[PDB]
From a paper:
The FeS protein external domain (FeS-ED) is mobile between the b (close to heme bL) and c (close to heme c1) positions.
When similar analyses were carried out without imposing C2 symmetry, three distinct maps were obtained for CIII2 (CIII2 c-c, CIII2 b-c, and CIII2 b-b at 3.8, 4.2, and 3.5 Å resolutions, respectively). These maps were superimposable with respect to cyt b and cyt c1 subunits, except for the FeS-ED portions. To better define the clusters of cyt domain of cy, the docking analyses were repeated using the three different conformers of native CIII2 (CIII2 b-b, c-c, and b-c). Interestingly, when the FeS-EDs are in c position (CIII2 c-c), the docking models gathered as a single cluster on cyt c1, slightly displaced toward the FeS-ED of the same monomer.
Author numbering:
A (entry chain D), E (entry chain Q): 5 to 107, 126 to 257
B (entry chain E), F (entry chain R): 11 to 191
C (entry chain C), D (entry chain P): 2 to 232, 237 to 428
The structure:
């Protein structure tokens, strides 16, 4: 049905293979236009998410663009301590660091990446340079598709992003059918990581605190029932 | 005397208190690193009238473009009908109709309007910068973020952008300057 | 009567050399063994909740300020530094942000408890005045604070809630510029707000000092229209340990729910648009400032000369009182009248548990509050305009006319004696 | 005796409805008409000076924080933004920076006035304890504050006065890292210091609250070893208006001199090297932290195993108590012993105006303080080492041994009766 | 004698012709190596110092180096609202924004610029790339000039700055002998301006406050003498 | 029982209070954006032994340079006499004499010292960066800020700089790596 993720609930600590797949997808597809400045590269070793091997992290970092410096202007080797690059303009898009919170979030990305079908039977010609999406709601609409008072008759609208993937864009090393849907789910989970890395710690803290406070509250209820006994016994 | 001396001491205390309080209320006013920002001048100085002129201010561009006759006639030949925003967003005047006579600009300290037009280069849809130099389907400006077609005088057309390009408060400095603010 | 029982410092030599600094005398005699009635329901806890929430907010803020950098170019980045690198991070921020919500929720129940059981009625005016002063301070605080992340909603909320001060004539733009540090919003506003936001809580604590001093000198309301009968008072058990423990139990429950929220539903009360950096060139849809200011936002954006009950066309008699100024006055009055209440209710009576008509009007008032909360978020298009106008009109009507009429013809009830209600 | 004269709230209806919140009762009965002796010299003013200076610093700081940006890359720039663009600028900064100097100068005279006229002697121990606590808080505050400009002296002063905590064994490096936010100094330290620096003054005010509560409950010391003779007390005129006006006159003079300094000699008490940005790679000559910490800096850097009176070679018996730790303990003890004084002076007597030997030793102590101040700035090369060692030794000797011996054999003086000294 | 300046005292509000002369020198001599980032270009119109004509300020600004931007990387027109440029390295020196306070200050600059005489008769060969200054004290010294315990026998030391001026380096428009000494004094005053622009306001505030507080203090003394009269009359 | 129940409630309250307090004292410790900084590795990986290797760290450069025989022999032929700073600033060992045997570096996890030398590229005079690649009057490093001549092993010579080039704490990672911190 709704294709719920793993983390959608009181449990679900970010199944990591899914995140490694999303990383294969993000660095080879989405990175061409998008960036994640709010994301340090070293986080690809921190627990909770992709617990990759540090050495591979340093390699992948040195293999990225050149972030010059802060003290002496000079194109450095881009050490992991720096942040992911930033694609800013000239046919590029926003930053995906926290896009999983600026919208139930990841379901938006899934049902957005999912859905770029051809132009409907109201404006088949479409638009030059703009492509159609069935779920983006903040895009333009031709006058042919609007109602009598400016509202659109289409489910979604026209987004400036092209279709990101075809039937079998990339291979998975673990062994898995790399259709469009699985890639969309995986990349959605990866972005949710990039936004909420400390999710599992959140849940564990919540459990511990609920327990301890229920205990404290029960003990206080007993103490209250006791103290207030000689005044609530005859009635 | 009792009265005089006592009341005078009180008055002096009050005066000193006020002289000490005023700066605590003055420091919050505009510091020097901002007063200059309010008034910014652009020296047109032979911009080769007819192509364009852009300058940074308030973090947004301020478009100062001369007029090309073909652009002008296309402008002056636009009846208010079929005009999305007929309010003449320009804040240097009242809500008078979005007409080219009112919508072009002041007259150099002289008497003429169909030669210069300085507006805020910020699309009213979501704040993108339209491309100039005769573009779009109306011989004006084209917004590449979502496809909004502007006209010669800057009034919005053919797109989601609800209103035209606003016009900040600006007056001339005697035939070679512009005052933005 | 009013047994203070100073303890006479007879414990031992330690309690006798403490005759240099009385402090323990104060605590014991007054702030712990303060005779409180037995008839207290579960509505007299929220003050402890408010005190604890205030302490919590102050602490978490003092911690955050060790990592927040007030500047347009480094605020968002510092907030992310917090939520990612710092050890506890997300906890402090979510506890700070949501705890404000609980704070205001708790003051709402604290205030409406008061309106019911005649806690504003004499001889408890000073407490009411101080409470309204506080409410104002804490509203201003939360406002200054929502700005610091320099998100997108921050900018525009500040923009409008500062254009208010500029609406008024003659001294509007001057005040606006003197408050923003300039013509529009920029880093200067941010610095002012951070400082101010990091200073008012202490003023609030002091005001809470006077708040607590007042209702210790003046007896706690009690469910009925009766006092502790000072003249020895078998009623009026002490505060410690009984009511202390009761309040702590309720507080444990409340914190349990609060942490469950923090850990499962933390971004629920927030606005997602505050997670995208600011663009002074683009405004999002449905700014919707927050949820503890929607009532007054609606009272403001209701009067627009768009109804047959539009008093703006009549107030236009004077060419100076335009619409904007009218709405601003309406909001300031919505609060000033709540403050003036104790001198409007012309009743020699007390808690509405013995005033039926008052019960009905009061529940209508609670409903009006909820409705205003729900309306400030919805557009100004029909029919919501009529709804907002009706609700504001009823608020003002209640607080101005309804209470006098009741005080006149509202005594069909047998008042209870003997605050010792052994039923 | 101890006439409080509560005023009985007999003024009028206003002073009768104020029976809800006592406040004016407190002010009048206690904090204004507090009977103070007639025998007060000009040394009992500096408390008013300290209160006013504290208010001044708090205000000016709240103003500066509206323009200071805590970050390594934008602190210096913000300070210059202040001194150039802002309207008042230089005034606030110079008044903030120098007023700290006056604050400490005034506490020095406040403290040494005390040591003379037996103000630490019973029954005035609590005041002394609270005062030492304050002194500590305000030292830490000024330290946190000298760092914020991110000049050159800031960095290195912080470096050393944090390496202190690291000297001790086992838990030194951990505390160092937990305090600096890391191995060495960087923006994290700056944020901590700014927050902390913007918070302690309020704790100081509260502690000043208790400071004022104590010596109102306990009578002000007086030049004589006598009390106000409570049993009606023709002596002991009230505070208002007499002593209020006297203190305000002295305060006007002091502010006059202070503003003359601010306007003609403002950069005199400062270190020029704090006007060059920081270089973690280059250290200047003669860091010379400040002038209100030189005594303890010298007591610290004196013990180095470089004299025949070097007790470090003897303390090396235990392999853990090295030199550094020894100096740190020596400084902490230099303060702890001053705090312990009231339980070391074994005299059933009072103000040294009737104890000659005490006069001589006390003037030697003042000279020792001045000498230590002058020595912390000069290198550790001969002969200054012997001087510093002698001075520290005398400080400790005074406070440990000298007072007992006096209390034993120090009563060749006729004590004065009748605090009404109409001479 | 000591060649005291105008501002050296309780008065002396920065004789402005001196500052215009110092500006003519700073932009034509010292600017080649030094900078003043902590100094906006719009201060050359603010009162107190050189009250130049704004238009000339805009011209002189546009005629300087290119300070690119803060939002969109693009070499602009170096608008006055920006700050003076910065010369950083490769044969360049520090920033002179507040050098008049990081040292009686301006006298250091005067007696420093003044004094680059030839190498003394202890090390006439000198050093390659370093030049000798009578007053700089933080420079190296050859071993031939040091005493038995490392202390130098020379008055000053060797500074990395070359002699900035000759006998008649520039012309003054007002009409004045432009010898080295006058230029040194003028530039020293200009730097003191760049460091303390709000000096005159300082002095005027000091005067006003001294006066008002003397008045208040006198009145309080009278009030005290009065109140304490019936208790200090018999003795 | 009275005693047991009361004391146990108190104990539980205390435990919960402490569990809530600890993080308020933990957040001030070193955040994630700094823990990484403490440990930094440099992959030597065939640096063409003999010329140089520089890497940024702590805001200052860390010089990792292989040894050239002529440079070595000049080093090992320096008696402690006539050596300004004979303390061997290297913090990976005690204040042992500034000798090349102790002053060069650890031995790759093997046994040899006259082949690598990694020091802090920061002049002890006032913190400038000396120029490398065989410079100065001693075949080592030369500081252009004031003229301080360093030697092959980094010990200060011929200038105001009081002490030699310090050596941070560093150990090897089994023949291809360096650990700085
Ligand atoms: C350029 C060829 C792109 C690549 C490849 C990808 N994206 Fe993108 N994206 C691009 C643009 C120009 C825009 C703006 C669209 C607009 O109309 O404004 C976007 C937008 C997105 C969004 C935001 C949608 C929204 O509601 O605002 C998302 C969530 C997004 N894109 C996701 C995404 C992913 C996961 C990609 C890799 C699989 C990816 N995009 C590639 C440009 C380009
Ligand atoms: C390069 C050709 C220079 C020009 C022209 C001027 N200065 Fe300079 N200056 C330069 C350097 C490389 C240094 C550093 C010297 C050192 O040994 O470190 C300096 C230094 C100064 C100083 C600081 C002196 C001190 O005590 O640290 C001052 C006050 C100074 N210079 C003044 C100055 C003036 C007024 C100039 C124009 C008349 C000027 N300098 C030109 C490089 C160069
Ligand atoms: C010691 C400092 C401090 C105190 C005291 C404090 N806060 Fe804050 N507050 C901050 C900081 C820092 C931020 C920005 C970081 C953040 O948003 O969490 C902030 C942000 C906020 C926000 C926005 C939260 C967000 O994430 O957008 C609100 C709402 C708020 N404060 C309300 C309050 C209220 C109400 C009080 C007390 C009456 C209070 N704060 C006390 C420091 C403090
Ligand atoms: C605008 C009104 C208002 C506000 C806001 C308010 N109070 Fe009260 N408070 C009252 C009134 C009325 C009473 C009843 C006093 C009585 O019964 O004598 C009261 C009572 C109390 C009590 C004792 C009885 C009780 O209800 O718990 C406490 C404790 C208390 N308040 C704390 C606080 C704190 C802490 C805050 C804010 C941080 C606060 N209050 C805000 C008006 C207010
Ligand atoms: C509300 C904020 C605030 C308060 C309260 C405050 N200060 Fe500061 N202080 C600052 C700021 C901001 C700076 C940095 C700007 C500056 O140096 O003037 C600073 C800097 C300082 C400095 C260094 C001055 C300089 O220019 O180098 C000292 C010393 C100092 N504080 C001491 C104190 C002491 C002592 C107190 C009270 C006991 C105090 N401050 C109260 C905000 C404050
Ligand atoms: C370490 C000691 C110490 C410190 C520091 C200190 N005090 Fe006191 N203070 C005393 C003592 C002792 C007395 C004498 C009390 C008495 O005579 O009963 C006193 C008395 C006073 C008095 C009343 C008589 C007088 O001397 O003026 C005031 C007012 C006062 N202090 C204010 C302050 C303030 C404000 C501060 C700091 C901001 C401060 N003090 C710091 C110890 C201290
Ligand atoms: S932003 Fe200009 S049209 Fe969408
Ligand atoms: S700084 Fe390296 S020698 Fe002067």
């Amino acid at each position: 049905p709704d294709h719920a993720f793993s983390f959608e609930g009181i449990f679900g600590k970010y199944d990591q293979a899914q995140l490694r797949r999303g990383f294969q997808v993000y660095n080879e597809v989405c990175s061409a236009c998008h960036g994640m400045k709010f994301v340090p590269i070293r986080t690809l070793a921190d627990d909770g998410g992709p617990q990759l091997d540090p050495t591979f992290v340093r390699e992948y970092a040195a293999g990225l663009d050149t972030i010059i410096d802060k003290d002496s202007g000079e194109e450095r080797d881009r050490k992991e301590t720096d942040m992911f690059p930033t694609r800013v303009g000239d046919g590029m898009g926003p930053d995906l660091s926290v896009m999983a919170k600026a919208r139930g979030g990841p379901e938006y990305i899934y049902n957005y990446v999912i859905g770029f079908e051809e132009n409907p039977e109201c404006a088949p010609e479409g638009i030059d340079g703009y492509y159609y999406n069935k779920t983006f709601q903040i895009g333009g609409v031709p006058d042919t598709c609007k109602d009598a008072a400016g509202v659109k008759i289409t489910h979604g609208s026209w987004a400036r992003m092209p279709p990101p993937l075809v039937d079998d864009q990339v291979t998975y090393e673990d062994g898995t059918p790399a259709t469009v849907d699985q890639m969309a789910q995986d990349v959605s989970a990866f972005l949710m990581w990039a936004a909420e890395p400390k999710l599992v710690a959140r849940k564990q803290m919540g459990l511990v605190a609920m327990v301890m406070l229920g205990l404290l509250s029960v003990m206080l209820y007993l103490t209250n029932k006791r103290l207030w006994a000689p005044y609530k016994g005859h009635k | 005397r009792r009265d005089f001396l006592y009341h005078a001491t009180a008055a002096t205390g009050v005066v000193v208190t006020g002289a000490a309080v005023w700066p605590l209320i003055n420091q919050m006013n505009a510091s020097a690193d901002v007063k200059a920002m309010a008034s910014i001048f652009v020296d047109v100085s032979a911009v080769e009238v007819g192509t364009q002129l852009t300058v940074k201010w308030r973090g947004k561009p301020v478009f100062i473009r001369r007029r090309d006759e073909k652009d002008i006639e296309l402008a002056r030949s636009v009846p208010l009908g079929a005009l999305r925003d007929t309010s003449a967003e320009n804040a240097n005047k009242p809500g008078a109709e979005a007409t080219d006579e009112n919508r072009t600009l002041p007259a150099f300290d002289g008497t003429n309007t169909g030669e210069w037009l300085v507006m805020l280069g910020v699309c009213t849809h979501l704040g993108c910068v339209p491309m100039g130099d005769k573009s779009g389907d109306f011989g004006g400006w084209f917004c590449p973020c979502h496809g909004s077609h502007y006209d010669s005088a800057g009034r919005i057309r053919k797109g989601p952008a609800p209103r035209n390009l606003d016009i900040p408060v600006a007056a001339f400095v005697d035939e070679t300057t512009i005052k933005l603010g | 009567s009013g047994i203070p029982h100073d303890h006479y410092e007879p414990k031992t030599g330690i309690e006798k050399w403490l005759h240099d600094r009385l402090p323990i005398v104060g605590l014991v005699y007054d702030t712990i063994m303060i005779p409180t009635p037995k008839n207290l329901n579960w509505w007299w806890i929220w003050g402890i909740v408010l005190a604890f929430t205030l302490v919590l907010q102050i602490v978490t803020g003092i911690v955050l300020a060790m990592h927040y950098t007030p500047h347009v170019d480094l605020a968002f980045a510092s907030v992310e530094h917090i939520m990612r690198d710092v050890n506890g991070g997300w906890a402090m921020r979510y506890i700070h942000a949501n705890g404000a919500s609980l704070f205001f929720l708790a003051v709402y129940i604290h205030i409406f408890r008061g309106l019911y059981y005649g806690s504003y009625k004499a001889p408890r005016e000073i407490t009411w005045i101080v409470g309204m002063v506080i409410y104002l301070l804490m509203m201003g605080t939360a406002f200054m604070g929502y700005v610091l992340p320099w998100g997108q909603m921050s900018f525009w909320g500040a923009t409008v809630i500062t254009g208010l001060f500029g609406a008024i004539p003659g001294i509007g733009p001057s005040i606006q510029a003197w408050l923003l540090g300039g013509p529009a919003v920029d880093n200067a506003t941010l610095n002012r707000f951070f400082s101010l936001h990091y200073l008012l809580p202490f003023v609030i604590a002091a005001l809470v000092a006077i708040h607590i001093w007042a209702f210790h000198t003046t007896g706690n309301n009690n469910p009925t229209g009766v006092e502790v009968r000072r003249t020895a008072e078998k009623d009026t058990l002490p505060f410690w340990p009984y009511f202390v423990i009761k309040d702590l139990f309720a507080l444990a429950l409340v914190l349990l729910g609060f942490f469950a929220v923090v850990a499962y539903m933390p971004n629920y009360l927030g606005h997602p648009d505050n997670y995208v950096q600011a663009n002074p060139l683009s405004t999002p849809a449905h700014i919707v400032p927050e949820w503890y200011f929607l009532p007054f936002y609606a009272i403001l954006r209701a009067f627009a000369a768009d109804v047959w009950v539009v008093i703006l066309v009549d107030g236009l008699t004077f060419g100076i009182v335009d619409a904007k100024f009218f709405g601003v006055i309406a909001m300031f009055g919505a609060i000033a009248v709540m403050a003036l209440a104790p001198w409007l209710d012309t009743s020699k009576v007390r808690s509405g548990a013995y005033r039926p008509k008052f019960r009905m009007w009061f529940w209508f008032l609670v409903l009006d509050f909820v409705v205003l909360t729900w309306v400030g978020a919805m557009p100004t298009e029909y029919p919501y305009d009529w709804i907002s106008l009706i609700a504001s009109t009823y608020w003002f009507a209640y607080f101005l006319v309804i209470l006098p009429l009741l005080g006149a013809t509202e005594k069909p009830e047998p008042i209870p004696a003997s605050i010792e209600e052994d039923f």
